[PDB]
């Protein structure tokens, strides 16, 4: 697959957005 495949790199960039909620948890998220 091209998308579903490249979705790994993308989705990955999201996996962070999750852990980011923590770094922002103090930012005033």
């Amino acid at each position: 697959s091209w998308l579903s495949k490249t979705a790994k790199k993308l989705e990955n960039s999201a996996k962070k957005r999750i852990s980011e909620g923590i770094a922002i948890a103090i930012q005033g998220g």
Side-chain angles (χ1 to χ4, degrees):
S1 208
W2 153 87
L3 218 46
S4 176
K5 188 194 77 153
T6 200
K8 209 62 41 58
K9 309 113 226 213
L10 308 211
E11 184 148 277
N12 265 221
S13 209
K15 302 308 101 156
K16 310 204 307 192
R17 295 291 300 172
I18 288 75
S19 163
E20 290 273 326
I22 315 173
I24 310 179
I26 44 272
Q27 294 275 48

